[PDB]
């Protein structure tokens, strides 16, 4: 059967809500490229021949962005179908609707709209199909993981997880998240059933990719209280069975906060998601052409950086990004059309399209959204966010936890300097 996937282009949580009032999370650029573009490229490369897009919040912008992409073309292979509705507001509400409309007929892949990965799912496909054929369709979902050290910056505390898995058949017997927990509790139900190869694993990174079967849609329809995949796995492991697949040589991660954003951007810039590198141009557009150099230097067309400026390490330059003199840029991604002043340093920052930086500014570990503006003699401490063309006053330093936007109750006051 032709492989198909279900793509959810909406995260039903307020974890990106100094920003998401303007554009959805799936449209946020990771490295000059939208988040949903990476997921679509991964789905196309992994062998999926048809995808369904379920967008509820700001569906018009998502549809407009998708229709002009390379994935909507007569020559494309992974045909996309955009389904927009304001009724559903949860993953369960979408999985119980995909069953009602009978869109899925075989083993499909359930993946969010902000997953950055290059994992080949063919081996997982074969393992899941063999398990279902041999066990009279007992397994219902194979969740893709990735072995990594717990101290890696990619593993955040919010998305941390620990499992108790039988090593013989790599089937999940317990699933819980470690959020503010110093000790972990494991029941004795799994030990009694099989005492051969029970193993507790804490070195697995939640890739958030889970290939499923229409039985999962039927179960989600049956249980109205189910809203999230975590709820489904908790309800299934208490009362069918769930297996996993462990990846060791391929990259995979889903962004959910600024920490995940920074980690994924750093990994992508350092070519950890090859061949999905900025210079590869996996999306066929003329405004994202780059050129790779030593120490991972990416330069767009017509940059024209000023004299005396040094690009130290892992910097992406957009198309038409004017750079001043005596600059110092390292570990930062700058979008197209930006104007950079003089004697200005950038360390682990992220500048989107349209930002202007005056001379003398010092920005470290910050994020600037579209059309933002920074005046002279302004110092930005780490973990500061400027959104939607907001401006700051000259000779003013922002504290560490200083998020500034034009919305009164969310963050600090408007752009009026």
């Amino acid at each position: 059967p032709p492989l198909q996937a279900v793509l959810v282009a909406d995260s039903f949580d307020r974890r990106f809500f100094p920003i998401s009032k303007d554009q959805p999370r799936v449209l946020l650029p990771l490295a000059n490229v939208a988040l949903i573009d990476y997921t679509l490229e991964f789905l196309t490369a992994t062998g999926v021949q048809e995808t369904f897009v379920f967008c509820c919040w700001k569906a018009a912008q998502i549809k407009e962005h998708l229709l002009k992409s390379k994935w909507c073309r007569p020559t494309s292979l992974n045909v996309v179908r955009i389904i927009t509705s304001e009724l559903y507001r949860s993953l369960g509400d979408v999985l119980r609707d995909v069953d009602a409309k009978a869109l899925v007929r075989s083993d499909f892949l359930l993946v969010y709209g902000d997953v950055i990965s290059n994992i080949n799912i063919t081996r997982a496909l074969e393992e899941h199909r063999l398990r279902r054929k041999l066990e009279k369709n007992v397994s219902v979902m194979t969740m893709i993981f990735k072995e990594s050290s717990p101290s890696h910056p990619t593993r955040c505390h919010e998305d941390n997880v620990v499992v108790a898995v039988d090593s013989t058949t790599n089937r999940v017997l317990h699933f819980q998240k470690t959020q503010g927990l110093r000790r972990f509790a494991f029941p004795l139900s799994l030990f009694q059933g099989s005492s051969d190869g029970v193993e507790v694993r804490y070195d697995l990174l939640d890739c958030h990719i889970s290939i499923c079967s229409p039985q999962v849609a039927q179960l989600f329809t049956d249980n109205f209280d189910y809203q999230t995949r975590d709820d489904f796995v908790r309800g299934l492991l208490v009362n069918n069975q769930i297996h996993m697949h462990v990846t060791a040589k391929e990259y995979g991660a889903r962004v959910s906060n600024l920490h995940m954003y920074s980690a994924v951007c750093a990994d992508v810039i350092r070519r950890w998601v090859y061949p999905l590198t900025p210079e590869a141009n996996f999306t066929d557009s003329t405004t994202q052409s780059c050129t790779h150099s030593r120490h991972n230097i990416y330069r767009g067309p017509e940059v024209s950086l000023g004299h005396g400026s040094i690009l130290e390490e892992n910097v992406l330059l957009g198309s038409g990004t004017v750079i001043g003199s005596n600059c110092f840029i390292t570990n930062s991604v700058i979008g197209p059309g930006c104007h950079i002043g003089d004697n200005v340093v950038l360390d682990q920052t992220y500048l989107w399209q349209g930002v202007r930086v005056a001379a003398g500014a010092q920005i470290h570990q910050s994020l600037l959204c579209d059309n933002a503006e920074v005046k002279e003699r302004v110092t930005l401490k780490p973990r500061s966010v400027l959104t939607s063309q907001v401006v700051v006053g000259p000779n003013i330093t922002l504290p560490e936890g200083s998020v500034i936007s034009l919305h009164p109750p969310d963050a600090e006051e408007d752009e009026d300097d």
Binding site: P150, R183, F186, P187, F191, S195, E199, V200, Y202
Partner: protein, 351 residues
């Protein structure tokens, strides 16, 4: 001396004869750990049995005034020991080369190294390499299901859990462990109390384990393990002591009517006419006098048959006499019991 060997010789209906002296494979039970200690270095060994045991190295026997825990017994013999002690159980029959756990004790400078075998109630945490000990708890000890500290998982993300492992009570202890036991007298029964203490304190103190899945590693503690160990002895005794023939001792009045395959017969146990001993260990001074069919059975010593009996899957204590043609199947006959010609059920008749 690099090591100091200690054996702790301090479940019913067969304890009239002392438990360390239980005849297993026509040999004393205490002979097996002693032989395991022997023929690999170990010219000396300390033994802490009671008076009833009257037990090659010159074994040092220390009588015990009253029953006490094994940890208390170890604390009692502190002046005798002067280095790292190797603690062994009184009733334990293995074929493993002792160097497997001694290498873990030596190379890693481990504070404790112990041996168990896979089964053929207790949860043991095993590192991915299969040697380091991480978790150890008994099911009845903790009311909560299973608690694992996050700190011990941060450094060891992968932990393998087993439930069927059987403890061999083969412990390699460092010198300061005995001092700690002396200054902390509340600790008793090292197997149940001290061992978990040294596991939770690592997260320096290190503990390693050598999991076995090929050997026997029998630890007789109940009647069920007693019968199983005897039937596996004949293969072991062939390699351990090839000098003594497995068939019979030289001073024997056996009938010479064959009917013996893979069966050990003790000294001067006269056999009558056309008997049948199939995979059974006959004791010492057993007067067999007729066509008796004995299959997979144990007779301690001085057990006499009279006229054409059937013996199947049973244990008989010493000084027991059967009468005429009784048929025996899956039974236990006490020491001195006189059972006439009848069919005996599973019931374990005792004196």
């Amino acid at each position: 001396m690099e090591f100091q060997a200690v054996v702790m010789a301090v479940t019913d209906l067969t304890s009239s004869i002392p438990k360390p002296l239980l005849p297993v494979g026509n040999k004393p039970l205490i002979w097996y750990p002693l032989n395991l200690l022997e023929r690999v270095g170990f010219e000396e060994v300390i033994v802490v049995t009671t008076r009833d045991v009257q037990k090659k190295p010159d074994i040092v026997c220390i009588p015990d005034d009253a029953d006490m825990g094994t940890a208390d017994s170890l604390r009692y013999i502190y002046p005798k020991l002067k280095t790292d002690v190797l603690v062994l159980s009184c009733d334990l029959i293995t074929d493993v080369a002792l160097h497997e756990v001694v290498d873990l004790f030596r190379a890693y400078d481990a504070s404790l190294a112990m041996l168990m075998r896979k089964g053929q109630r207790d949860f043991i945490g095993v590192d991915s390499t299969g040697k380091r000990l991480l978790f150890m708890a008994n099911e009845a000890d903790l009311d909560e299901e299973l608690v694992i500290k996050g700190s011990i998982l941060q450094k060891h993300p992968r932990i393998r859990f087993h439930t069927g492992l059987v403890d061999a009570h083969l412990y390699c202890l460092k010198k300061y462990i005995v001092d700690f036991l002396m200054e902390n007298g509340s600790i008793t029964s090292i197997r149940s109390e001290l061992i978990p203490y040294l596991v939770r304190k690592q997260f320096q103190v290190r503990c390693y384990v050598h999991i076995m899945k090929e050997g026997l590693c029998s630890r007789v503690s109940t009647l069920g393990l007693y019968m199983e160990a005897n039937r596996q002895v004949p293969k072991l005794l062939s390699a351990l002591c090839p000098e003594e023939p497995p068939v019979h001792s030289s001073a024997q009045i056996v009938s010479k009517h064959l009917v013996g395959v893979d069966s050990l017969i003790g000294p001067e146990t006269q056999i009558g006419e056309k008997s049948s001993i199939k995979r059974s260990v006959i004791g010492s001074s057993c007067l067999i006098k007729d066509r008796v069919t004995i299959t997979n059975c144990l007779l301690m010593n001085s057990v006499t048959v009279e006229e054409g009996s059937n013996i199947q899957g049973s244990v008989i204590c010493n000084n027991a006499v059967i009468e005429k043609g009784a048929d025996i199947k899956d039974c236990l006959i006490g020491s001195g019991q006189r059972i006439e010609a009848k069919a005996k059920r599973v019931n374990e008749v005792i004196v």
